[PDB]
Amino acid sequence: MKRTFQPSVLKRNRSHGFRARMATKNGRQVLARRRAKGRARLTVSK
Template sequence: MKRTYQPSKVRRARTHGFLVRMKTRGGRAVINARRAKGRKQLSRV
């Protein structure tokens, strides 16, 4: 049986990237929460 996770950098960036996060209010909240926590990496790409 084929594995369910077939990694693709493009697809990952398009769903979890910084630009996608900044598009919505909720996404911006996520970024701000990670900034407040002091995360080294805010989002992928």
């Protein structure tokens, strides 16, 4: 049947994108933790 993941790049980027992380104090902490963990991909990008 119909499953839970229905893609939309526009909505992907608006919810989870780099600029959205940067817009709030807590999203900027998501990036900090990820960079400290040494993640290759901070967010899903182009």
